[PDB]
């Protein structure tokens, strides 16, 4: 393969100037500052850029990338987004399920990942761990070979690498450029970008572009770059490393100083007669969701800290509440007691439902990068992980908290009731994290979110019906109370609690009323609190609910649809 | 000076095997690479670290180290310790306020500090600030300038530098070597340890010391280690860094190998020969607290944005309850709107005094630096710093809550109701700081102090008297009401509103109770509430709360006393 | 509004106390609370318990497991059952009722007398 | 719970004469106080509740009179009709406790 690029004019202010150059089977790296266009000039060259910007061509082999292109290139991202809970093995399984074509076997993709595997050196760290914090993993040497070895699946012509060394050792990036050349030697492009190398790095290079604010400063054999500067008019001392030399010349030891003369240069005379020269889904859907959620549920088992930790804590706070609030009574104090606990456990749910900011922030990059490749849709995606991470770890602890408490606290003893509550729960759980998925869906950073979250769950909470009577606001304020969660949530339990109860002992209030202000029975201090009598005054807040869900989880999949990509 | 160490043992498993040498006037660097003894020589070199684990001798011109040390000399630290708040003049001022002798005139502090920023280089920057978050600074090159200032302040004659150039670029760590070499000539003795540096770099070096694994690969002139190498039976290729070519020997392009020949060399007998040759507070607590005080009030004024948005929160917020809960009526629903509104205060202190983690975890590490350099003492840091941030940030959202909110509500029209109010919200602002605090002091992250000071003040508001009763609570378990901070404050808050107060219109209950379970007035409450109605039961809350504050902070004292330092 | 009560007025020790009373004149699934109470010698009066109009119980703590209080509507009574007694508890022994609305036991039994004895 | 105790355990009067008990609690009451009488061979009898009113059945010669934790049931000009045990009662807090009872005699 050979790439070719001609006259590239990225806008985004202006980043690259005017870039010509083409790159033939070898290793071709892209130096420069950090400023200059080094990790700007890979992504256009890799169609990882919004084309709205570009203004040249970019050739392969005399004809235009096509739509096809990015499938059939390898691009390893510098940070990693290997699967830190999988194995080597099965990171690359993931990747040739929704890599790979539907006709081949299963027999064929193990093959191509035992091929793969062997070409790399991953034999005897083939089915360890790549490690996460929790989880003693491999070296940060070998999880860059995995990295590779993810995109060699598809075994494409052309490899782009975003910073193949940036954070390895140097003994560790010296092997990872060894084994990088004898790759190119097979016959593959490959085409990365440097930070200050070393000489025994530069010289492996076959060719070489120089770019320094957004401006080409050279572009030819690596080799040669040493006596182009020096004929230029500048030395290079001995114990010098060239690449070091190259940005001490960039620095000041004048852009367009170098700039001009490399437009005068005989590199760029042979480049511009060179490109005058020649120019003169994969997958269906249930494949991919049964693929997203099998490695969203193994990763959600191979890291049972942050998940069952989450029901220790429901176990010990349920046990809690359970002895706290034991044997509740129909006395004076039966009213205050069951409106707190059942006030505590739907704001409870409601609190501990942040976690779910987590679920599309932390994996961001990967989601960017797998869905630019061509993983899979946003849609199979969506609901892949809300199949194997929400759905899972929200039921449970609504169970587990019905089926302690509600025994221990001495409930409405009825089949319904016991279940209602449990359903209640469940939906305010549900309800709570679809929020939090709305509003973290598309960020990168968590503090931000849960902290509109905590204000947001702060400011419904006054409007659930315990801290102010809803019945006594004003009429200009008191329409708020319907985006309340905790509001339908508490309505619900406490329809459900206090429907057949006495609380004055000795009085037959059911009957009639002694004295006007009692508060003797609950249908009382339900209608005290202004709240249906009716079934439908129970079933109302679980429609609420569920259109909640509903309205949330459209908003996060459209924050997700037009997040941007590039 | 010359600094000489002689059979250099520290042991934490051990770090340093067996190091010998000596560093005269001039630029003296410690290369290898990280795991070997290149930042644990510079500690032990410069008195910053336990003698416990000392075994060889450490010495000065013939005499050792006095106790007098590390006040004498300087020492940068690698990343930034100046207050980006201040300006590069004022961060001096604190610097020689604190360093020099109080014999001296204020015009003679400010002429040494002129004559600093002279030689620097800072004075067109001398009065803008050195930078945060928020505020814009200078670049990161002049701020290790000012932190260099900071160190020459009492004019040293050893200054040590923890790698002076690792996070600057090239161009700017070029300049500052430059400067530090500049300096090197007038006499001082510089001594760094530097990672990976580039051959302009090298060129200035008077005496290079490599250390690997804990072991002295190399000792001597810094321009004699190529030689050293050549004839130790390696070779160095054309444009090859010599740091480099010493990491790439350490690495293995053996370490009892190169050991052994250093050992046998002549280096190693010249300087054995050199070592058998020879040995063959500043102020007052006023003022310590008064600067303390005053620069954390600078950097509490210097950062606006998080100390004006919690007064723009208090403001919106108070404005918020103050609409939802305008008029308080004497009816059916007043005692659970003043209960509930009572309670939201009380709680929403508690929570937000939860940004008192920040207070001592943020400038952990310029504490650590500046009680080792001979500062101040941990009593005079600890009570300025709170006298200057704690104090004043804490008692304001008391009084504009109060002030706001008060009459809004229409609570008890009296002016000692207004100010016990104002004075509970205080004390249980300045309760749950201090707590806090205690738990938040010495440690370095701020997510585990927050996920426990959250998990015990969703313990204590359970235990706070509205939600479940405390009177109901049984025995084994009652006495943990005696550990909330909530509970104090709200059954002070509810002591102080409903004492004089009718619920019941046309009944006049305060004279008898018609039906035995009305609840018409507010003593009725309280004693249901299990609340004392003498006034000892109002201030029996206040003495608990200021006995609360006292314990927490003493116990944070105690944990930044023996927080170690080393 | 008219109560009785009726049983066994001496018990050996340690194997149970049961009385009964007797309403006439109301119903005892319509309004009030039935309490017991018994007058040691040496008078010192002690609440036990009461059972509630619609079944539910409230004992007094100092009788930890060892009374029970049941009913049987279908000729409007209810039962204070004392098990493992003592010679300690040889008291005087009535029911009460309790309004409820008004907080006081306004009407009460005649009281038999029970001797713990062997 | 909620201890009530009576200072005179016993007093002794003549007809016509003032006489008055005492009552004082261990914890707020707020006036659910009741005053039974037994006589010799009888079951208590309601006298006074809310601790001011007076029960049907009763001359105008008792009241009460109390707040807090201190109460009084005052009989004046007494007859011979009205010796007898006193007993205070709080029904407040739900384990009902009964006062030692003050014994009325005649001079």
């Known amino acids: 393969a050979v790439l070719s690029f001609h006259n590239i004019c990225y806008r985004v202010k202006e980043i690259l100037s005017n870039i010509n150059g083409i790159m033939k089977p070898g290793l071709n790296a892209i130096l420069g500052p950090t400023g200059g266009g080094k990790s700007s000039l890979l992504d256009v060259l890799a169609a990882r850029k919004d084309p709205s910007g570009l203004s040249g061509d970019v050739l392969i082999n005399g004809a235009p990338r096509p739509a096809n292109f990015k499938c059939n290139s390898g691009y390893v991202v510098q940070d990693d987004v290997v699967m830190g809970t999988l194995t080597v093995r099965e990171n690359l399984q993931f990747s040739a399920a929704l890599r790979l074509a539907t006709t081949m076997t299963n027999h064929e993709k193990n093959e191509r990942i035992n091929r793969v595997i062997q070409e790399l050196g991953l034999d005897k760290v083939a089915d360890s761990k790549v490690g996460t914090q929790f989880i003693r993993g491999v070296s940060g040497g070998e999880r860059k070979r995995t990295s590779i070895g993810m995109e060699l699946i598809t075994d494409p012509s052309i490899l782009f690498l975003d910073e193949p060394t940036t954070g390895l050792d140097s003994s560790t990036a010296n092997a990872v450029l060894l084994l990088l050349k004898r790759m190119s030697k097979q016959g593959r492009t490959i085409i990365f970008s440097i930070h200050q190398p070393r000489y025994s790095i530069f010289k492996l290079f076959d060719s070489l572009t120089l770019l320094a604010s957004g401006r080409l400063m050279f572009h030819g054999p690596a080799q040669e770059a040493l006596g182009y500067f020096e004929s230029a008019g500048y030395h290079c001392e001995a114990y010098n490393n060239p690449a070091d030399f190259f940005l001490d010349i960039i620095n000041g030891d004048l852009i367009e100083k170098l700039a001009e003369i490399y437009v005068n240069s005989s590199f760029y005379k042979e480049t511009k007669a060179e490109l005058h020269q020649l120019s003169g889904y994969t997958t269906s859907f249930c494949h991919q969701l049964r693929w997203v959620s099998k490695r969203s549920f193994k990763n959600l088992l191979g890291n049972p800290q942050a998940s069952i930790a989450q029901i220790i804590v429901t176990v010990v706070l349920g046990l809690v509440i359970g002895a706290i609030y034991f044997g509740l009574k129909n006395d004076s104090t039966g009213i205050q007691n069951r409106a707190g606990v059942l006030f505590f456990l739907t704001t409870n749910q409601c609190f501990s439902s942040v976690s779910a900011v987590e679920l599309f922030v932390v994996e961001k990059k990967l989601f960017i990068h797998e869905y630019i490749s061509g993983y899979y849709r946003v849609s199979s995606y969506f609901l892949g992980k809300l199949l194997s991470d929400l759905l899972p770890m929200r039921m449970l602890p609504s169970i587990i908290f019905t089926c302690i408490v509600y025994f221990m606290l001495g409930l409405k003893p009825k089949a319904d009731a016991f279940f209602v509550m449990m359903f209640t729960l469940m939906m305010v759980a549900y309800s709570a994290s679809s929020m939090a998925l709305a509003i973290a869906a598309g960020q990168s950073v968590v503090s931000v979110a849960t902290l509109l979250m905590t204000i947001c769950f702060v400011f419904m909470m006054i409007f659930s019906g315990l801290l102010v009577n809803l019945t006594t606001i004003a009429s200009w304020l008191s329409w708020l109370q319907y985006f309340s969660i905790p509001r339908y949530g508490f309505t619900a339990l406490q329809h459900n609690e206090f429907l057949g109860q006495n609380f004055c002992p000795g009085l037959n209030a059911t009957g009639n009323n002694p004295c006007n202000y009692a508060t003797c029975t609950g249908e009382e201090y339900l209608v005290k609190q202004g709240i249906d009598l009716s079934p439908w005054g129970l079933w109302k807040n679980h429609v609420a609910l569920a259109c909640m869900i509903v309205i949330f989880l459209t908003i996060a999949y459209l924050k997700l649809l037009f997040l941007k990509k590039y | 000076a010359v600094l000489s160490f002689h059979n250099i043992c520290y042991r934490v498993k051990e770090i340093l095997s067996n190091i010998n040498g000596i560093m005269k006037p001039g630029l003296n660097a410690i290369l290898g690479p990280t795991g070997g003894g290149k930042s644990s020589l510079l500690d032990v070199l410069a008195a910053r670290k336990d003698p416990s684990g000392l075994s060889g001798d450490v010495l000065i011109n013939g005499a050792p180290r006095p106790a007098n040390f590390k006040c004498n000399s300087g020492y940068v630290v690698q990343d930034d310790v100046v207050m980006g708040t201040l300006t590069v003049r004022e961060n001096l001022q604190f610097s020689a306020a604190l360093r020099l002798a109080t014999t001296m005139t204020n015009h003679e502090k400010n002429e040494r500090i002129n004559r600093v920023i002279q030689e620097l280089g800072l004075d067109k920057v001398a009065d803008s600030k050195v930078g945060t978050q928020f505020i814009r600074g200078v670049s990161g090159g002049e701020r290790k300038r000012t932190s260099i200032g900071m160190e020459l302040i009492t004019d040293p004659s050893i200054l040590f530098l923890d790698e002076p150039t690792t996070g600057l670029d090239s161009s700017t760590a070029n300049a500052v070597l430059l400067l530090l070499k500049r300096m090197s000539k007038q006499g001082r003795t510089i001594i760094f340890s530097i990672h990976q540096p580039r051959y302009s770099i090298f060129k200035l070096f008077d005496s290079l010391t490599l250390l690997a694994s804990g072991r002295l690969m190399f000792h001597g002139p810094a321009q004699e280690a190529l030689g050293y190498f050549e004839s130790a039976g390696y070779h160095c290729e054309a444009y090859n860094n010599p740091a480099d070519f010493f990491l790439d020997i350490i690495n293995g392009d053996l370490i009892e190998k190169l050991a052994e020949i250093y050992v046998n060399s002549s280096f190693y007998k010249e300087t054995k020969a050199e070592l058998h040759q020879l040995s063959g507070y500043t102020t007052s607590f006023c003022h310590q607290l008064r600067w303390v005080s005053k620069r954390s009030f600078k950097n509490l004024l210097g950062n606006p944005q998080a100390s004006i948005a919690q007064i723009i929160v208090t403001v919106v917020l108070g404005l918020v309850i103050g609409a939802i809960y305008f008029g308080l009526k004497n009816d059916s629903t007043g005692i659970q709107n003043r209960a509930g509104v009572l309670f939201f205060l009380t709680t929403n202190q508690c929570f937000s005094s939860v940004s008192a983690v920040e207070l001592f975890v943020v400038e952990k590490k310029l504490f650590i630096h500046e009680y080792i350099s001979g500062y101040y003492r941990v009593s005079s840091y600890f009570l300025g710093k709170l006298l200057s941030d704690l104090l004043p940030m804490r008692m304001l959202p008391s009084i504009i809550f109060t002030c706001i909110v008060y009459f809004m509500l229409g609570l008890k029209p009296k002016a000692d109701a207004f100010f016990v109010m104002m004075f509970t919200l205080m004390m249980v602002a300045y309760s749950a700081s201090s707590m806090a605090l205690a738990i938040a002091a010495g440690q370095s992250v701020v997510s585990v102090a927050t996920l426990l000071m959250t998990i015990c003040f969703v313990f204590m508001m359970i235990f706070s008297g509205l939600l479940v009763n405390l009177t109901t609570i049984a025995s084994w378990l009652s006495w943990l009401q005696y550990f909330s901070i909530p509970r104090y404050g709200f059954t002070a808050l509810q002591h102080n509103e409903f004492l004089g107060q009718n619920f019941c219109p046309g009944l006049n209950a305060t004279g008898n109770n018609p039906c035995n379970y009305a609840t018409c007035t507010g003593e009725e409450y309280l004693v249901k509430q299990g609340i004392d109605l003498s006034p000892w039961g109002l201030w029996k809350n206040h003495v608990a709360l200021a006995c609360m504050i006292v314990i927490f902070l003493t116990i944070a004292y105690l944990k930044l006393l023996f927080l170690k330092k080393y | 509004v008219q109560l009785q009560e009726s049983g066994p007025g001496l018990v050996k020790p340690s194997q149970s106390l049961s009385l009964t009373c007797t309403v006439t004149?109301?119903?005892?699934?319509?309004?009030?609370?039935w309490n017991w109470i018994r007058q040691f010698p040496g008078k010192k009066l002690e609440w036990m318990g009461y059972?509630?109009?619609?079944?539910?119980?409230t004992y007094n703590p100092s009788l930890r497991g060892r009374i029970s209080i049941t009913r049987d509507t279908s000729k409007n009574q209810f039962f204070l059952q004392l098990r493992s007694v003592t010679p300690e508890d040889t008291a005087t022994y009535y029911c009460?009722?309790?309004?409820?609305?008004?907080?006081?036991?306004?009407?009460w039994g005649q009281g038999t007398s029970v001797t713990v004895s062997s | 719970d909620i201890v009530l105790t009576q200072s005179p355990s016993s007093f002794s009067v003549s007809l016509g004469d003032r006489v008055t008990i005492s009552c004082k609690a261990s914890?707020?009451?707020?006036?659910?106080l009741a005053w039974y009488q037994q006589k010799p061979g009888n079951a208590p009898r309601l006298l006074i509740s809310?601790?001011?009113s007076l029960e049907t059945g009763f001359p105008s010669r008792f009241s009460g009179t109390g707040s807090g934790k201190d109460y009084t049931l005052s009989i004046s000009s007494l007859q011979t009709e009205d010796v007898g045990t006193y007993y205070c009662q709080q029904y407040w807090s739900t384990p009902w406790t009964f006062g030692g009872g003050t014994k009325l005699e005649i001079r």
């Open positions: 009460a009722t309790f309004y409820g609305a008004k907080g006081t036991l306004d009407y």
């Open positions: 059972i509630n109009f619609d079944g539910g119980t």
């Open positions: 809310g601790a001011t």
């Open positions: 914890g707020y009451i707020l006036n659910r």
């Open positions: 004149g109301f119903s005892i699934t319509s309004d009030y609370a």
